[PDB]
Amino acid sequence: MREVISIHVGQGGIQVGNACWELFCLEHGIQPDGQMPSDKTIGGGDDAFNTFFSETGAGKHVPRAVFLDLEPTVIDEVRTGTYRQLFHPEQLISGKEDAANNFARGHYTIGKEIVDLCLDRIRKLADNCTGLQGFLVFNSVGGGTGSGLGSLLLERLSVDYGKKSKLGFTIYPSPQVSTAVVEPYNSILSTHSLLEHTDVAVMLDNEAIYDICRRNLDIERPTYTNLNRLIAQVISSLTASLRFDGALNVDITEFQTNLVPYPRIHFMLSSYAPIISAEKAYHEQLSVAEITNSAFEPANMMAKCDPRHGKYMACSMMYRGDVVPKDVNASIATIKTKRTIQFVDWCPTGFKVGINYQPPTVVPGGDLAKVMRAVCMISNSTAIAEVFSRLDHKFDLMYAKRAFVHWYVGEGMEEGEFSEAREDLAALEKDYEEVGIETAE
């Protein structure tokens, strides 16, 4: 009735996915094998797990998500891991020789190799599904298939269904921290082929995960376990409406042309809170106002792009748990109140409340403390264009020096893809350039 499905790519990406399905399975508490601890009573009023966990004729409830990546080592760990009763073989599609972070390889070269298997799996699930709203696709501009092969993936999947929503979680090159140097190539080559195949998607950067887990989670020494846990929470709440009763169970498609008013600049930030320790869970109270005012801390901004340097457009503060329409509401007045913040005035307010009544659940072994209320500030501003500009200037020079270009030209891409894709970020620079212009008079 209300389905979504997750797709996983790139090393960090399927790392995220593993964390996620660990999470949801924890949260509905269905045991890793595929059974719930106990029988399910027959009831109505709304869906349940049925969105994602797959009903069998018995205690076998597998996700509705798919793995695809050409670097097949790690995924085997899932193939080995505790959830080897959880998942399902045909759920698993991997490539042996990954891209080597040639975008053009797993996009072009090995792009040709596994696509059809992917699409068949997709047809099996969507055919298995009925009211699948949209598509959860995860990848990374690092684990190279996460850029290339995913690029073809949406490039064709969109042309397959279209009417489904594109739920885009991919990681963005951290501003000064990194993984490689061809990242310019991965990213921008992705981007010009990303945009028109993307509906909307958010940009998760890691350095924020570090700084904030270390200060706010009080973390001393983190890694992808903590990161994947954190994105696990954020996606855990970004879709609760289709999973749990909330006052305004807003929906993705609902989010689509309302958060991203124009068609073009359709990405965003997301600073979840309240992430604190057990020793800050106590020694604190964690007000709605604390999560709320705290929600707009630029230093809390969960992607390393200063909001205060941008002007907000929309903010879908979907809330978990014991939320009051009034209290949050006045907090939103407080958000109108913030002098430092500046909004796409031709969209004076574009707010859209989310009050889901389940407060958050915590993953044992985790660092986040337990609370009563969650916020997701999926918000869109002018600010985020800048780091892009860093990307196209860095890539600008490096590409000017023809660095690495032999690698890509060797695999079947043309140079005008490069300069033209730079025209692509040129245009989007005109977009964040223009939409931020205040309409005259």
Partner 1 sequence: MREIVHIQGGQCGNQIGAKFWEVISDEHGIDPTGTYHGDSDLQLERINVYYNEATGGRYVPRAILMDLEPGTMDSVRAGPFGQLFRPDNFVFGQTGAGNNWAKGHYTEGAELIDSVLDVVRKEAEGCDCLQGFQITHSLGGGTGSGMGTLLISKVREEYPDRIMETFSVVPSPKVSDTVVEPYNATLSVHQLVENADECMVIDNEALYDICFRTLKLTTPTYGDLNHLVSAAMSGVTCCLRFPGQLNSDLRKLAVNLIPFPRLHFFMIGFAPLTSRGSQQYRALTVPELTQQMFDAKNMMCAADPRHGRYLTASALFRGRMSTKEVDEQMLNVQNKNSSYFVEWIPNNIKSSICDIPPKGLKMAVTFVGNSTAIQEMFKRVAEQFTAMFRRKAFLHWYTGEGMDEMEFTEAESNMNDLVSEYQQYQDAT
Annotated binding site for Mg(2+): 71
281 binds partner 1 (CB under 8 A): no
Beta strands (DSSP E) in 141-251 are 165-171, 200-204
Helix (H, G, I), strand (E, B) or coil at 188: helix
Q: Count Cα atoms within 13 angstroms, Cβ side, for 229.
A: 19
Task: Write the binding mask 223 to 262 for partner 1: x where contact by CB under 8 A, - elsewhere.
Answer: xx--------------------------------------
11 binds partner 1 (CB under 8 A): yes
How, if at all, do strands 314-321 and 373-380 pair?
A: antiparallel
Q: How far apart are CA 242 and CA 63, in angstroms?
A: 15
Tell me the C-alpha distance between 218 and 201, whole Å.
29
Binding pattern for the stretch 177-196 against partner 1, x by CB under 8 A and - elsewhere: xxxxxxx-------------
Angle 395-401-404 from CA coordinates, rounded to 5°: 75
Under the rule (CB under 5 A), what is the footprint of Mg ion? 69-71, 98, 143, 145
Q: Which of 10, 34, 222, 360 binds partner 1 (CB under 8 A)?
A: 222
Q: Which tokens belong to 27? A: 């949260």
> Which residue, 327 or 415, has its beta carbon nearer to partner 1?
415
Identify which range of 85-93, 222-230, 302-310, 414-422 contacts partner 1 by CB under 8 A: 222-230
Distance of CA 421 to the CA centre of its chain: 23
**Of these partners, partner 1, Mg ion, none, which one is at the site of residue 257 (CB under 5 to 8 Å by kind)?**
none
Find the part of the chain contacting partner 1 (CB under 8 A) among 73-81, 342-350, 358-366, 419-427: 73-81
Alpha helices, DSSP H, located in 58-198: 73-80, 103-104, 115-128, 148-160, 183-194
Under the binding rule (CB under 8 A), the answer on residue 398 touching partner 1 is yes
The yes or no reply on residue 15 touching partner 1 (CB under 8 A) is yes
Q: What is the DSSP secondary structure assignment for residue 337, as one 8-state letter?
A: T
DSSP code for 162: -
Residue 145 contact partner, candidates Mg ion, partner 1, none, CB within 5 to 8 A by sort of partner? Mg ion
3-state secondary structure of 267: strand
Q: How far is the CB of 11 from partner 1 (least distance, A)?
A: 6
User: Binding to partner 1 by residue 74, rule CB under 8 A?
Assistant: yes
189's tokens: 């080559």
Does 278 sit near partner 1 (CB under 8 A)? no
Q: Report the relative pairing of strands 314-321 and 3-8 from DSSP bridges.
A: unpaired
How many residues line the site for partner 1 (CB under 8 A)? 38
Catalytic residues: 254
Cite the annotated binding site by residue number: 11, 71, 140, 144-145, 179, 206, 228
**Which residues, in sequence order, are bridge partners of residue 314?**
380
**Closest to partner 1 by CB, 219 or 375:** 219
Residues of span 84-103 touching partner 1 by CB under 8 A: 96-98, 100-102
Q: Residue for token digits 């399975």?
A: 25
Tally Cβ neighbours within 10 Å of residue 432: 19
Q: Smallest distance from the beta carbon of 406 to partner 1, in angstroms?
A: 6
State the binding partner of 163 from Mg ion, partner 1, none, CB within 5 to 8 A by kind. none
Rounded-to-integer distance, Cα 439 and Cα 441, Å: 7
For binding to partner 1 (CB under 8 A), which residues are involved? 11, 15, 71, 73-74, 77, 96-98, 100-102, 144, 176-183, 210, 214, 219-224, 394, 397-398, 401-404, 406-407
